[PDB]
Symmetry: C3
Subunit: 113 residues, 3 copies
Amino acid sequence: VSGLNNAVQNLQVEIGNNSAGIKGQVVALNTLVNGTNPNGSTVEERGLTNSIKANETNIASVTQEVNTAKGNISSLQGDVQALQEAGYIPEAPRDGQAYVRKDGEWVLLSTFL
Amino acid sequence: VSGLNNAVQNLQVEIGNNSAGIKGQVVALNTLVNGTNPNGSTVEERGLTNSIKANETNIASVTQEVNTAKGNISSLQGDVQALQEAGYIPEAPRDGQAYVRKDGEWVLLSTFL
Amino acid sequence: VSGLNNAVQNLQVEIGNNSAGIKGQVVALNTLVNGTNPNGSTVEERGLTNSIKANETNIASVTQEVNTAKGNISSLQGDVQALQEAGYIPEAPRDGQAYVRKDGEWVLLSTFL
Ligand SMILES: [Cl-]
Ligand SMILES: [Zn+2]
Ligand SMILES: [Zn+2]
Ligand SMILES: [Zn+2]
Protein backbone atom coordinates (compact mmCIF):
# COMPACT_ATOMS: atom_id res chain seq x y z
CA VAL A 1 0.00 0.00 0.00
CA SER A 2 2.99 2.36 0.58
CA GLY A 3 3.19 3.16 -3.16
CA LEU A 4 -0.44 4.32 -3.34
CA ASN A 5 -0.03 6.20 -0.02
CA ASN A 6 2.86 7.88 -1.83
CA ALA A 7 1.03 8.68 -5.05
CA VAL A 8 -2.07 9.85 -3.11
CA GLN A 9 -0.08 12.21 -0.94
CA ASN A 10 1.57 13.66 -4.05
CA LEU A 11 -1.74 14.56 -5.58
CA GLN A 12 -2.86 16.26 -2.37
CA VAL A 13 0.22 18.42 -2.27
CA GLU A 14 -0.48 18.92 -6.00
CA ILE A 15 -4.10 20.10 -5.84
CA GLY A 16 -2.90 22.04 -2.82
CA ASN A 17 -5.02 24.46 -0.84
CA ASN A 18 -6.22 28.07 -1.12
CA SER A 19 -2.69 29.17 -0.67
CA ALA A 20 -0.78 26.65 -2.78
CA GLY A 21 -0.93 24.24 -5.67
CA ILE A 22 -3.55 24.24 -8.37
CA LYS A 23 -6.21 25.33 -5.89
CA GLY A 24 -4.03 28.30 -4.94
CA GLN A 25 -3.41 29.42 -8.51
CA VAL A 26 -7.13 29.28 -9.39
CA VAL A 27 -8.13 31.20 -6.24
CA ALA A 28 -5.79 33.98 -7.31
CA LEU A 29 -7.23 33.87 -10.83
CA ASN A 30 -10.78 34.35 -9.51
CA THR A 31 -9.69 37.06 -7.13
CA LEU A 32 -8.19 39.09 -9.96
CA VAL A 33 -11.14 38.55 -12.29
CA ASN A 34 -13.84 39.47 -9.79
CA GLY A 35 -12.04 42.00 -7.62
CA THR A 36 -11.61 42.86 -3.92
CA ASN A 37 -13.43 46.13 -3.80
CA PRO A 38 -15.67 47.17 -6.68
CA ASN A 39 -15.66 50.87 -5.68
CA GLY A 40 -11.92 50.46 -5.45
CA SER A 41 -9.30 52.59 -7.09
CA THR A 42 -7.13 49.93 -8.80
CA VAL A 43 -7.70 47.46 -11.61
CA GLU A 44 -6.93 44.59 -9.17
CA GLU A 45 -9.34 46.02 -6.62
CA ARG A 46 -12.19 46.36 -9.11
CA GLY A 47 -11.40 43.08 -10.81
CA LEU A 48 -10.61 42.56 -14.49
CA THR A 49 -14.26 42.26 -15.48
CA ASN A 50 -15.39 45.50 -13.83
CA SER A 51 -12.36 47.36 -15.14
CA ILE A 52 -13.12 46.29 -18.76
CA LYS A 53 -16.78 47.24 -18.36
CA ALA A 54 -15.75 50.68 -16.98
CA ASN A 55 -13.26 51.48 -19.75
CA GLU A 56 -16.07 50.47 -22.07
CA THR A 57 -18.58 53.08 -20.91
CA ASN A 58 -15.93 55.72 -20.57
CA ILE A 59 -14.79 55.20 -24.13
CA ALA A 60 -18.40 55.38 -25.25
CA SER A 61 -18.76 58.70 -23.39
CA VAL A 62 -15.67 60.42 -24.71
CA THR A 63 -16.84 59.36 -28.11
CA GLN A 64 -20.16 61.16 -27.74
CA GLU A 65 -18.47 64.39 -26.70
CA VAL A 66 -16.06 63.99 -29.61
CA ASN A 67 -18.97 63.63 -32.04
CA THR A 68 -20.65 66.68 -30.60
CA ALA A 69 -17.50 68.80 -30.68
CA LYS A 70 -16.76 67.77 -34.28
CA GLY A 71 -20.16 69.16 -35.17
CA ASN A 72 -19.56 72.38 -33.30
CA ILE A 73 -16.34 72.94 -35.08
CA SER A 74 -17.99 72.33 -38.47
CA SER A 75 -20.43 75.08 -37.78
CA LEU A 76 -17.52 77.19 -36.59
CA GLN A 77 -15.61 76.74 -39.81
CA GLY A 78 -18.62 77.84 -41.81
CA ASP A 79 -19.16 80.87 -39.57
CA VAL A 80 -15.53 81.93 -40.09
CA GLN A 81 -15.74 81.18 -43.82
CA ALA A 82 -18.71 83.50 -44.00
CA LEU A 83 -16.96 86.34 -42.12
CA GLN A 84 -13.83 85.92 -44.29
CA GLU A 85 -15.89 86.08 -47.52
CA ALA A 86 -17.85 89.05 -46.30
CA GLY A 87 -15.42 91.67 -47.64
CA TYR A 88 -15.39 93.97 -44.67
CA ILE A 89 -13.31 97.07 -44.77
CA PRO A 90 -10.64 98.08 -42.27
CA GLU A 91 -10.32 101.38 -40.46
CA ALA A 92 -9.47 104.50 -42.50
CA PRO A 93 -6.27 106.46 -41.60
CA ARG A 94 -6.40 108.45 -38.35
CA ASP A 95 -4.72 111.71 -39.37
CA GLY A 96 -7.25 114.47 -38.76
CA GLN A 97 -8.64 114.14 -42.28
CA ALA A 98 -11.98 113.04 -43.74
CA TYR A 99 -12.06 110.02 -46.07
CA VAL A 100 -14.62 108.48 -48.45
CA ARG A 101 -14.76 105.06 -50.20
CA LYS A 102 -13.48 104.62 -53.79
CA ASP A 103 -12.07 101.51 -55.62
CA GLY A 104 -10.75 99.59 -52.59
CA GLU A 105 -8.79 102.62 -51.30
CA TRP A 106 -9.81 105.34 -48.78
CA VAL A 107 -9.63 108.77 -50.51
CA LEU A 108 -9.46 112.25 -49.00
CA LEU A 109 -12.86 113.89 -49.14
CA SER A 110 -11.15 117.26 -49.78
CA THR A 111 -10.12 115.89 -53.23
CA PHE A 112 -13.76 116.39 -54.32
CA LEU A 113 -14.73 119.17 -51.87
CA VAL B 1 -7.55 -0.18 1.75
CA SER B 2 -10.56 1.79 3.14
CA GLY B 3 -8.31 4.76 4.02
CA LEU B 4 -7.00 5.11 0.45
CA ASN B 5 -10.53 4.55 -0.93
CA ASN B 6 -11.41 7.47 1.33
CA ALA B 7 -8.56 9.76 0.32
CA VAL B 8 -9.05 8.89 -3.39
CA GLN B 9 -12.74 9.69 -3.31
CA ASN B 10 -11.97 13.03 -1.64
CA LEU B 11 -9.69 14.07 -4.44
CA GLN B 12 -12.32 13.17 -7.03
CA VAL B 13 -14.92 15.31 -5.35
CA GLU B 14 -12.10 17.88 -5.12
CA ILE B 15 -11.05 18.03 -8.78
CA GLY B 16 -14.77 17.85 -9.43
CA ASN B 17 -16.37 18.08 -12.85
CA ASN B 18 -17.34 20.78 -15.35
CA SER B 19 -19.90 21.97 -12.92
CA ALA B 20 -18.05 21.71 -9.61
CA GLY B 21 -14.70 21.65 -7.89
CA ILE B 22 -11.47 22.86 -9.37
CA LYS B 23 -12.53 21.68 -12.83
CA GLY B 24 -15.71 23.74 -12.51
CA GLN B 25 -13.94 26.92 -11.45
CA VAL B 26 -11.44 26.69 -14.33
CA VAL B 27 -14.19 26.01 -16.90
CA ALA B 28 -15.88 29.22 -15.80
CA LEU B 29 -12.57 31.07 -15.99
CA ASN B 30 -12.05 29.98 -19.62
CA THR B 31 -15.63 30.75 -20.51
CA LEU B 32 -15.26 34.33 -19.31
CA VAL B 33 -11.88 34.84 -20.95
CA ASN B 34 -12.85 33.51 -24.37
CA GLY B 35 -16.53 34.40 -24.52
CA THR B 36 -19.85 32.83 -25.56
CA ASN B 37 -20.65 34.92 -28.56
CA PRO B 38 -17.97 37.11 -30.12
CA ASN B 39 -20.49 39.31 -31.99
CA GLY B 40 -22.26 39.52 -28.67
CA SER B 41 -23.36 42.63 -26.87
CA THR B 42 -21.87 42.06 -23.39
CA VAL B 43 -18.35 41.82 -22.02
CA GLU B 44 -19.11 38.26 -20.82
CA GLU B 45 -20.50 37.33 -24.21
CA ARG B 46 -17.48 38.62 -26.11
CA GLY B 47 -15.03 37.33 -23.54
CA LEU B 48 -12.47 39.36 -21.61
CA THR B 49 -9.85 39.10 -24.34
CA ASN B 50 -12.07 40.34 -27.16
CA SER B 51 -13.47 43.11 -25.00
CA ILE B 52 -9.95 44.42 -24.17
CA LYS B 53 -8.93 44.24 -27.84
CA ALA B 54 -12.10 46.18 -28.81
CA ASN B 55 -11.67 48.96 -26.24
CA GLU B 56 -8.14 49.13 -27.57
CA THR B 57 -9.04 49.95 -31.17
CA ASN B 58 -11.84 52.22 -30.13
CA ILE B 59 -9.53 54.25 -27.94
CA ALA B 60 -7.06 54.44 -30.79
CA SER B 61 -9.86 55.74 -33.05
CA VAL B 62 -11.22 58.43 -30.78
CA THR B 63 -7.65 59.53 -30.37
CA GLN B 64 -7.20 60.08 -34.09
CA GLU B 65 -10.34 62.20 -34.32
CA VAL B 66 -9.17 64.13 -31.27
CA ASN B 67 -5.82 64.85 -32.93
CA THR B 68 -7.55 65.98 -36.09
CA ALA B 69 -10.03 68.20 -34.28
CA LYS B 70 -7.26 69.79 -32.19
CA GLY B 71 -5.64 70.80 -35.46
CA ASN B 72 -8.86 72.20 -36.85
CA ILE B 73 -9.37 74.31 -33.83
CA SER B 74 -5.82 75.65 -34.03
CA SER B 75 -6.47 76.88 -37.50
CA LEU B 76 -9.77 78.27 -36.25
CA GLN B 77 -8.11 80.27 -33.52
CA GLY B 78 -5.73 81.82 -36.01
CA ASP B 79 -8.58 82.64 -38.40
CA VAL B 80 -10.46 84.42 -35.60
CA GLN B 81 -7.27 86.13 -34.41
CA ALA B 82 -6.83 87.48 -37.91
CA LEU B 83 -10.43 88.79 -38.16
CA GLN B 84 -10.14 90.37 -34.69
CA GLU B 85 -6.87 92.14 -35.62
CA ALA B 86 -8.26 93.30 -38.91
CA GLY B 87 -9.71 96.56 -37.58
CA TYR B 88 -13.01 96.46 -39.38
CA ILE B 89 -15.45 99.26 -38.90
CA PRO B 90 -19.05 98.95 -37.75
CA GLU B 91 -22.12 100.39 -39.40
CA ALA B 92 -22.55 104.19 -39.45
CA PRO B 93 -25.70 105.70 -37.79
CA ARG B 94 -28.97 105.16 -39.68
CA ASP B 95 -30.62 108.58 -39.35
CA GLY B 96 -31.18 109.86 -42.88
CA GLN B 97 -27.78 111.55 -42.94
CA ALA B 98 -24.57 111.02 -44.92
CA TYR B 99 -21.37 110.16 -43.04
CA VAL B 100 -17.65 110.01 -43.91
CA ARG B 101 -14.65 108.47 -42.06
CA LYS B 102 -12.43 110.60 -39.77
CA ASP B 103 -10.26 109.62 -36.71
CA GLY B 104 -12.18 106.51 -35.60
CA GLU B 105 -15.54 108.36 -35.59
CA TRP B 106 -18.21 108.68 -38.34
CA VAL B 107 -18.69 112.41 -39.17
CA LEU B 108 -21.56 114.15 -40.95
CA LEU B 109 -20.62 114.87 -44.53
CA SER B 110 -22.60 118.14 -44.33
CA THR B 111 -19.92 119.43 -41.90
CA PHE B 112 -17.61 119.84 -44.93
CA LEU B 113 -20.28 120.26 -47.65
CA VAL C 1 -5.11 -2.76 -5.14
CA SER C 2 -5.63 -2.66 -8.96
CA GLY C 3 -8.79 -0.55 -8.55
CA LEU C 4 -6.99 2.18 -6.58
CA ASN C 5 -4.01 1.98 -8.98
CA ASN C 6 -6.65 2.64 -11.62
CA ALA C 7 -8.39 5.52 -9.88
CA VAL C 8 -5.02 7.08 -8.89
CA GLN C 9 -3.70 6.99 -12.42
CA ASN C 10 -6.90 8.62 -13.66
CA LEU C 11 -6.46 11.57 -11.37
CA GLN C 12 -2.86 12.03 -12.51
CA VAL C 13 -3.87 12.14 -16.13
CA GLU C 14 -6.65 14.46 -14.90
CA ILE C 15 -4.55 17.05 -13.02
CA GLY C 16 -2.20 16.65 -15.95
CA ASN C 17 0.96 18.67 -16.47
CA ASN C 18 1.94 22.11 -17.77
CA SER C 19 0.83 21.05 -21.15
CA ALA C 20 -2.35 19.11 -20.39
CA GLY C 21 -5.20 18.60 -17.96
CA ILE C 22 -6.25 21.02 -15.30
CA LYS C 23 -2.65 22.08 -14.73
CA GLY C 24 -2.35 22.88 -18.43
CA GLN C 25 -5.52 24.96 -18.59
CA VAL C 26 -4.50 27.03 -15.54
CA VAL C 27 -0.97 27.62 -16.88
CA ALA C 28 -2.51 29.07 -20.02
CA LEU C 29 -4.86 31.20 -17.92
CA ASN C 30 -1.94 32.72 -16.00
CA THR C 31 0.07 33.22 -19.14
CA LEU C 32 -2.73 35.26 -20.71
CA VAL C 33 -3.40 37.28 -17.56
CA ASN C 34 0.22 38.22 -16.87
CA GLY C 35 1.66 38.34 -20.36
CA THR C 36 4.78 37.19 -22.25
CA ASN C 37 6.35 40.51 -22.99
CA PRO C 38 5.14 43.63 -21.20
CA ASN C 39 6.65 46.02 -23.78
CA GLY C 40 4.97 43.79 -26.32
CA SER C 41 2.68 44.85 -29.11
CA THR C 42 -0.30 42.51 -28.56
CA VAL C 43 -2.88 42.11 -25.82
CA GLU C 44 -1.67 38.51 -25.27
CA GLU C 45 1.93 39.66 -25.12
CA ARG C 46 1.23 42.37 -22.55
CA GLY C 47 -1.20 40.22 -20.61
CA LEU C 48 -4.83 41.03 -19.83
CA THR C 49 -3.97 43.00 -16.70
CA ASN C 50 -1.43 45.30 -18.36
CA SER C 51 -3.68 45.81 -21.35
CA ILE C 52 -6.62 46.92 -19.13
CA LYS C 53 -4.34 49.25 -17.15
CA ALA C 54 -3.04 50.77 -20.43
CA ASN C 55 -6.47 51.37 -21.98
CA GLU C 56 -7.29 52.96 -18.65
CA THR C 57 -4.61 55.66 -18.77
CA ASN C 58 -5.13 56.25 -22.44
CA ILE C 59 -8.83 56.84 -21.95
CA ALA C 60 -8.02 59.20 -19.11
CA SER C 61 -5.66 61.10 -21.43
CA VAL C 62 -7.96 61.49 -24.40
CA THR C 63 -10.51 62.71 -21.92
CA GLN C 64 -8.27 65.53 -20.73
CA GLU C 65 -7.62 66.72 -24.27
CA VAL C 66 -11.34 66.50 -24.96
CA ASN C 67 -12.10 68.68 -21.92
CA THR C 68 -9.50 71.20 -23.00
CA ALA C 69 -10.71 71.32 -26.60
CA LYS C 70 -14.34 71.73 -25.49
CA GLY C 71 -13.22 74.82 -23.63
CA ASN C 72 -11.33 76.18 -26.60
CA ILE C 73 -14.31 75.81 -28.79
CA SER C 74 -16.52 77.60 -26.26
CA SER C 75 -14.27 80.58 -26.39
CA LEU C 76 -14.27 80.26 -30.16
CA GLN C 77 -18.04 80.39 -30.36
CA GLY C 78 -18.10 83.54 -28.29
CA ASP C 79 -15.38 85.15 -30.42
CA VAL C 80 -17.39 84.42 -33.58
CA GLN C 81 -20.62 85.56 -31.92
CA ALA C 82 -18.93 88.84 -31.14
CA LEU C 83 -17.65 89.35 -34.72
CA GLN C 84 -21.09 88.44 -36.13
CA GLU C 85 -22.84 90.96 -33.82
CA ALA C 86 -20.33 93.64 -34.58
CA GLY C 87 -22.18 95.04 -37.61
CA TYR C 88 -19.23 95.49 -39.89
CA ILE C 89 -19.76 96.89 -43.32
CA PRO C 90 -18.72 95.30 -46.60
CA GLU C 91 -16.73 96.87 -49.40
CA ALA C 92 -18.33 99.72 -51.39
CA PRO C 93 -18.76 99.27 -55.20
CA ARG C 94 -15.54 99.45 -57.25
CA ASP C 95 -16.65 101.56 -60.23
CA GLY C 96 -14.41 104.63 -60.27
CA GLN C 97 -16.82 106.56 -58.07
CA ALA C 98 -16.66 107.97 -54.52
CA TYR C 99 -19.16 106.72 -51.93
CA VAL C 100 -20.25 107.80 -48.44
CA ARG C 101 -22.29 106.02 -45.72
CA LYS C 102 -26.07 106.61 -45.37
CA ASP C 103 -28.88 104.35 -43.95
CA GLY C 104 -27.26 100.95 -44.57
CA GLU C 105 -26.55 101.75 -48.25
CA TRP C 106 -23.41 103.22 -49.90
CA VAL C 107 -24.37 106.50 -51.69
CA LEU C 108 -22.53 108.41 -54.40
CA LEU C 109 -20.72 111.37 -52.90
CA SER C 110 -21.50 113.38 -56.07
CA THR C 111 -25.19 113.33 -55.00
CA PHE C 112 -24.28 115.94 -52.35
CA LEU C 113 -21.21 117.47 -54.06
CL1 LIG D 1 -10.09 47.54 -21.39
ZN1 LIG E 1 -4.38 104.61 -54.71
ZN1 LIG F 1 -16.14 112.79 -31.70
ZN1 LIG G 1 -31.25 102.59 -51.76
